[PDB]
Amino acid sequence: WLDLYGILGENLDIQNFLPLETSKFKSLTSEYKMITTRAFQKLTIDSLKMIKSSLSTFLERQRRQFPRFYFLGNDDLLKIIGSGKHHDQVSKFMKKMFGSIESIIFFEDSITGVRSVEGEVLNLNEKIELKDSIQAQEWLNILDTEIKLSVFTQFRDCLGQLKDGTDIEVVVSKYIFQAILLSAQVMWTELVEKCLQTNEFSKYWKEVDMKIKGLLDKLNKSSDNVKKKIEALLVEYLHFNNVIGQLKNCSTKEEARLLWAKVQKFYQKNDTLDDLNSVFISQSGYLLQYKFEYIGIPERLIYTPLLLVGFATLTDSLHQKYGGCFFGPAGTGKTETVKAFGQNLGRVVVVFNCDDSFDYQVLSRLLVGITQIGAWGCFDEFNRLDEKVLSAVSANIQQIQNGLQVGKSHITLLEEETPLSPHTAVFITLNPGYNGRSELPENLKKSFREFSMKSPQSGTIAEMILQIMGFEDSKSLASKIVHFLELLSSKCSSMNHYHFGLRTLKGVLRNCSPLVSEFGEGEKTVVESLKRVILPSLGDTDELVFKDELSKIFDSNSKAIVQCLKDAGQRSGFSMSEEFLKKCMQFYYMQKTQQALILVGKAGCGKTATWKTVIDAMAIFDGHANVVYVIDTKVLTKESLYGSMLKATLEWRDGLFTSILRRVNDDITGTFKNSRIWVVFDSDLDPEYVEAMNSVLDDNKILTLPNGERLPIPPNFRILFETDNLDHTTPATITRCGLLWFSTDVCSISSKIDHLLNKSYEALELDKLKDLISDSFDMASLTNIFTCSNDLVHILGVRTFNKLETAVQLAVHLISSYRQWFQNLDDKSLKDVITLLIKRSLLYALAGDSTGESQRAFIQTINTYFDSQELSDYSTIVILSFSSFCSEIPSVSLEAH
Amino acid sequence: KIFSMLEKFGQFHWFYGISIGQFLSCFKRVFIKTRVDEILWLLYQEVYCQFSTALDKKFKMIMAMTMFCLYKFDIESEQYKEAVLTMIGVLSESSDGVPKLTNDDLRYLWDYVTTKSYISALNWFKNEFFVDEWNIADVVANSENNYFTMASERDVDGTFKLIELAKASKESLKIIPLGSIENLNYAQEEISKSKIEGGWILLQNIQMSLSWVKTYLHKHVEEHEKFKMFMTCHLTGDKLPAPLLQRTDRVVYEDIPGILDTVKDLWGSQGVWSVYCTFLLSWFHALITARTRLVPHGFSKKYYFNDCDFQFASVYLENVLATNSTNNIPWAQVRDHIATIVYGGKIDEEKDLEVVAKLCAHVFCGSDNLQIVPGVRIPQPLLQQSEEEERARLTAILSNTIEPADSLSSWLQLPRESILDYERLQAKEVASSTEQLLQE
Numbered sequence A: 001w002l003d004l005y006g007i008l009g010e011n012l013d014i015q016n017f018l019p020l021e022t023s024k025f026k027s028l029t030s031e032y033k034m035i036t037t038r039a040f041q042k043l044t045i046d047s048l049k050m051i052k053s054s055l056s057t058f059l060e061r062q063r064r065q066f067p068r069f070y071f072l073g074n075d076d077l078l079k080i081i082g083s084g085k086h087h088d089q090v091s092k093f094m095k096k097m098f099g100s101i102e103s104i105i106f107f108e109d110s111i112t113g114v115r116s117v118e119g120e121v122l123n124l125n126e127k128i129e130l131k132d133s134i135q136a137q138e139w140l141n142i143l144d145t146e147i148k149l150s151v152f153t154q155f156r157d158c159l160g161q162l163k164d165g166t167d168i169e170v171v172v173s174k175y176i177f178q179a180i181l182l183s184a185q186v187m188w189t190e191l192v193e194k195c196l197q198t199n200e201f202s203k204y205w206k207e208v209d210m211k212i213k214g215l216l217d218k219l220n221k222s223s224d225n226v227k228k229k230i231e232a233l234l235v236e237y238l239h240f241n242n243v244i245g246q247l248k249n250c251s252t253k254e255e256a257r258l259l260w261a262k263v264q265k266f267y268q269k270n271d272t273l274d275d276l277n278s279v280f281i282s283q284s285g286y287l288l289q290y291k292f293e294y295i296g297i298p299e300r301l302i303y304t305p306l307l308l309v310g311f312a313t314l315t316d317s318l319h320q321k322y323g324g325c326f327f328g329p330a331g332t333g334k335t336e337t338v339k340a341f342g343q344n345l346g347r348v349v350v351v352f353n354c355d356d357s358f359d360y361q362v363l364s365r366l367l368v369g370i371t372q373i374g375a376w377g378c379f380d381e382f383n384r385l386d387e388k389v390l391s392a393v394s395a396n397i398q399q400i401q402n403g404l405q406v407g408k409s410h411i412t413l414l415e416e417e418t419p420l421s422p423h424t425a426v427f428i429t430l431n432p433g434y435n436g437r438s439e440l441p442e443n444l445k446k447s448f449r450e451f452s453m454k455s456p457q458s459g460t461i462a463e464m465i466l467q468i469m470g471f472e473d474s475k476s477l478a479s480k481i482v483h484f485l486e487l488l489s490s491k492c493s494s495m496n497h498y499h500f501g502l503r504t505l506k507g508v509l510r511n512c513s514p515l516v517s518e519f520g521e522g523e524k525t526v527v528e529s530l531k532r533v534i535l536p537s538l539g540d541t542d543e544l545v546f547k548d549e550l551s552k553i554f555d556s557n558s559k560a561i562v563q564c565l566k567d568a569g570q571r572s573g574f575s576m577s578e579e580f581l582k583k584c585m586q587f588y589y590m591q592k593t594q595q596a597l598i599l600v601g602k603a604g605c606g607k608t609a610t611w612k613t614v615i616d617a618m619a620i621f622d623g624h625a626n627v628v629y630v631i632d633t634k635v636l637t638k639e640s641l642y643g644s645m646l647k648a649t650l651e652w653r654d655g656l657f658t659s660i661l662r663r664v665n666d667d668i669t670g671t672f673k674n675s676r677i678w679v680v681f682d683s684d685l686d687p688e689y690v691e692a693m694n695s696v697l698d699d700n701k702i703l704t705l706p707n708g709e710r711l712p713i714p715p716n717f718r719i720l721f722e723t724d725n726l727d728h729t730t731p732a733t734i735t736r737c738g739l740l741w742f743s744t745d746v747c748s749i750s751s752k753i754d755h756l757l758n759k760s761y762e763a764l765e766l767d768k769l770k771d772l773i774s775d776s777f778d779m780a781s782l783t784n785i786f787t788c789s790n791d792l793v794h795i796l797g798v799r800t801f802n803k804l805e806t807a808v809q810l811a812v813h814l815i816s817s818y819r820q821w822f823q824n825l826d827d828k829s830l831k832d833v834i835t836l837l838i839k840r841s842l843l844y845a846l847a848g849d850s851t852g853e854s855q856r857a858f859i860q861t862i863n864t865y866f867d868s869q870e871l872s873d874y875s876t877i878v879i880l881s882f883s884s885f886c887s888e889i890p891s892v893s894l895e896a897h
Numbered sequence B: 001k002i003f004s005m006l007e008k009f010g011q012f013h014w015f016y017g018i019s020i021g022q023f024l025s026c027f028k029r030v031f032i033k034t035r036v037d038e039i040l041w042l043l044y045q046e047v048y049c050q051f052s053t054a055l056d057k058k059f060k061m062i063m064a065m066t067m068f069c070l071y072k073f074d075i076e077s078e079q080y081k082e083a084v085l086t087m088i089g090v091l092s093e094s095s096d097g098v099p100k101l102t103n104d105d106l107r108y109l110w111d112y113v114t115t116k117s118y119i120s121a122l123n124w125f126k127n128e129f130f131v132d133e134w135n136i137a138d139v140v141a142n143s144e145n146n147y148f149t150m151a152s153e154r155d156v157d158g159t160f161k162l163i164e165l166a167k168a169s170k171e172s173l174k175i176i177p178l179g180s181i182e183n184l185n186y187a188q189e190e191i192s193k194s195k196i197e198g199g200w201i202l203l204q205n206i207q208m209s210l211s212w213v214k215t216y217l218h219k220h221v222e223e224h225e226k227f228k229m230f231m232t233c234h235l236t237g238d239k240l241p242a243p244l245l246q247r248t249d250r251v252v253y254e255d256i257p258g259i260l261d262t263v264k265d266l267w268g269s270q271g272v273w274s275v276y277c278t279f280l281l282s283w284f285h286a287l288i289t290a291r292t293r294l295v296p297h298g299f300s301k302k303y304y305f306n307d308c309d310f311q312f313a314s315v316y317l318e319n320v321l322a323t324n325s326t327n328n329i330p331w332a333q334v335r336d337h338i339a340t341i342v343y344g345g346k347i348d349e350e351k352d353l354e355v356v357a358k359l360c361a362h363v364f365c366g367s368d369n370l371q372i373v374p375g376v377r378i379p380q381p382l383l384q385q386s387e388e389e390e391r392a393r394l395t396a397i398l399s400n401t402i403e404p405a406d407s408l409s410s411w412l413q414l415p416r417e418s419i420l421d422y423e424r425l426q427a428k429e430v431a432s433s434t435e436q437l438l439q440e
């Protein structure tokens, strides 16, 4: 109702666009006003959903007005257009429409500035005045322009200060990161060019070195905003130092010029009066224009040689308005290379996780969304699209490239003419040679430039990042880390899920970053992080290999969490064994930093028990409430898991996972503010089901819906995978997830028996009966019986570890049923009856799936393995005495008919 | 006999089936373009020229060799036929023996095969007997049919050749890829529009909308002179309908197997220094495309190098030469860029990166006198000539270049033994096919 009154019932000169829709809105308004008056003193929702059908063209024209509305749902579009005077529903969509902006700072009906995702504040040059009569798109457009103008103004001020000769340590505390970055890089390239005019490079090397040392010294006493800003400036300044050191080590002038041409150089025009197009980025002769979009303080990438060559080939592709293509294995830095290239070019890259459900209409709608905006599109996992869709959208991509090259103003896609912004570009990142993936046709691959990045430089990444935390020894430690990972990859059993590329090293670094608070900056921290990341994903003998190699190449309290897990296991009835508590420690320490975890083991090995009791321990430890949404993945269709677009009227119907994500994103009642949300996919890991979550699992933390919606993943939103094998699971899914491997069962036979007995008793005098039943389960004879059970022939082969469910449940239920006649007999008779009943239950639970001769053999062995009442092949209890089935046969005299 | 051979090829692969309408149109074209033997000779040449383009390279040489065999067995004597059989046998490693001495052509082929030049022996029949060849342009120009289909292996496309043909004939294309309902509807509307006032239409990946292809395209081909229809299909894809295929001309686009022929093609597809750099780039692309077909020793895998790489490297060369007017052109920069960015993005193995870097070091050394191949040497441009004289000089130095019979090893600077293995396997397969074909 509020959305409808905002779009039509309140705005003036807006009801004449669709007079029939205006009349329908008036009739619905009268009906709903009568209903509201009756309530204050079903059919309405159906009528509203019916009248949204004519609103589709209205919403499409509204999206044409402000092109960034394409990244919003129809419900969110209704909310933002209906925000006539509240001016707060519009701020919640900044992250969806921009990516790097969280909310808008408002001050007495005026806009002061915008705030980034990381907490950075960008203050506008002039405050924007909002009136009551203005609608959203005009002041969103002027805010979009004002953000770019403010970013350029801060860049110009910082660059003037740097030209004035002041140190960067006093300007980092005054401006946003992007201004500091661009001004510092312009000064760096000017000073390096001036040094290249001569043969002298050592003086600037010393200058940059002591600048880096001063920045590292001032890092430890700065606020978190200044911490992130300084860390990104150390990334760029270490790139500067590496380039200057390489130039100094160069023997001749020509190779120095070649090395200088191989690297980015950001210049600035001094004659053009257009402020936003005054900065151009040079590489290998080509020139690319800055856009001055707000970037924020991202997690900057270390400038490896592979990253520089990738930037060079992306510039070479975009100089001719072609596409960017990155092919290789998983965890190599393709999407991150694209995003870092975009952040270097001063614009947020919009990433799309392509899927088989993305038909021609969906992909073309996303194309007209991003060409109208002018944003950069990273079509992540472009193999996953069907081959028919890949062929069909080739014409659209060719038209986009032709319009960009020839400078056309409009492009005709999806039977509608829309304007073409000249700042757009297309990037694809795909993983060739995986099972269950389509192959790109050559007519489409000729529109992209592919660049192989199979082998990243992990040593440089580790060395520079560990230097950024400030480790005293960084080169030797990084070399030891990389050698350890290589020899661990070479000296382990070659199973399908052992992957030790860049992703596990980076997870080691993310685990070592908050671990120095308890271990200190040193080798103990990195070996603890290596254990916490890598050990849970290894088997039994590979664990010994890991320990031996760790002792070879490296030299070397948590009582509260263990107490909480012990309490949780006591409440749940589990037994805190060594292996079970070890798996609990591994899961807890791995989930402390990693969001998506895959639990792998045999059937009934202890996955659900492990994560349920760790969740209980976390809830009782931190005090935070917790919700769990277990979704059986393969039971539901993909269209029922994510959602399907109804082709009858082009509306979006939310799937289950998307519905849960939207419910946790909106947070209407405020109850999801301080809670952890676990979504458990308790089924097989189908690649077609879990590679649609590729952008969800990695550091993007975003779900790219077919209808253009971009739902962010909250930090307290963790995904659990519970499967049995990883036979068909691709390495793209394995590397993104902190894996927990269950090599053996976490529970002993006696512990499982005790847990089942206690759970069955809790699910129901009682004390004496429970004691007698517990004493009757003689574990010494039970283990011999279970070992002798393994020699039978079983149909529907199930391990004997999981037949205790049937045995315990049958025994407890039959004892409870026979409890009626248990008050008028001696203790020995009761003991014999209970022993016989448990013998029968064990027989029909263990050998019940065997033949008659095998069941006779098993009843003989259970008789000889247990004075006790002997159970025969036809033993039974009548209404409480022992008898046989011979005397229980009734006489039958069938009629002819 | 030729008709039975053609249906045997149609039995081999579903794309090579031959109808009677096309063959009778060829027979009419023979007269359109000792007298009965001359009519037979023109028949042989015209049928070879028409139906070579419908086959890939191995079937091209197979059909050329068996057709020359049929013609010469009709014309010549029995001893010549026995010599040809035993020479194919030693080519097929089935019968070993020197052919009987008699004219002169047999001596040339004996010298070709005794020098372990199998590719030269296979292509010598094309060199001697058939004196004409047809590309896509000649097929489209000399066809009375209104509909065309084009087949090529995966990871290679000839859409750019059709675009160049359209630009050469001053026509207009409308690229309509298939695979979705909207594309099919727009295809139907454009088909009606360009049937009622002309214009070219090209359909991409028609093996991906097979139901629509079996219904609408079949019923439309079954039932303006300035209108044409082009279709793109894959040789390793699904089976296109026989009634649809026999009613449309079939062209198989594959990369030119030669080296000097590839240089001539890339040179004909086009200051003085831009011309020189374009010449060097065309030579480099031809050499690397000749090298990439030797799977185990030429590269570590199978890589494709299409017109996009040549275009991007040419644009980079023009950008470097325009932005560096001081004439101290950074050849190290150009070498690193071409070996690392343009042609090296597809390359995933480090040994192949090393060999492409070595090739770029050989072709872009920036010396005054460069021996790019062991036979041909190119000088650097002078400072008193123009674009036209430079183009004439480079075309003249291409015309005077003669490719030797050992160009698969010496020109690529590779050991002979791998070339022997590859050429021997290829010739053995071709000769086994023609021995299974010729006896029946």
Ligand SMILES: Nc1ncnc2c1ncn2[C@@H]1O[C@H](COP(=O)(O)OP(=O)(O)OP(=O)(O)O)[C@@H](O)[C@H]1O
Residues within 6 Å of the ligand: A573, A574, A575, A576, A577, A580, A602, A603, A604, A605, A606, A607, A608, A609, A610, A722, A723, A724, A746, A747, A751, A752, A755
């Ligand atoms: N430490 C333990 N103490 C007591 N019982 C345990 C323990 N670990 C596991 N169990 C028991 O093991 C049985 C099967 O284990 P669980 O429920 O964890 O299976 P799962 O890993 O979810 O299996 P699936 O492959 O079906 O998903 C349960 O009945 C549970 O009570």
Ligand SMILES: Nc1ncnc2c1ncn2[C@@H]1O[C@H](COP(=O)(O)OP(=O)(O)O)[C@@H](O)[C@H]1O
Residues within 6 Å of the ligand: A300, A301, A302, A303, A304, A307, A329, A330, A331, A332, A333, A334, A335, A336, A337, A380, A429, A456, A461, A502, A503, A506, A698, A699
């Ligand atoms: N300098 C860097 N270069 C490449 N990757 C990096 C760098 N620094 C960190 N990383 C990590 O490497 C991973 C790159 O993932 P990526 O390979 O781009 O995904 P995809 O395989 O989908 O392209 C990220 O998780 C990121 O944390």
Ligand SMILES: [Mg+2]
Residues within 6 Å of the ligand: A334, A335, A380, A381, A429, A430
């Ligand atoms: Mg990716």
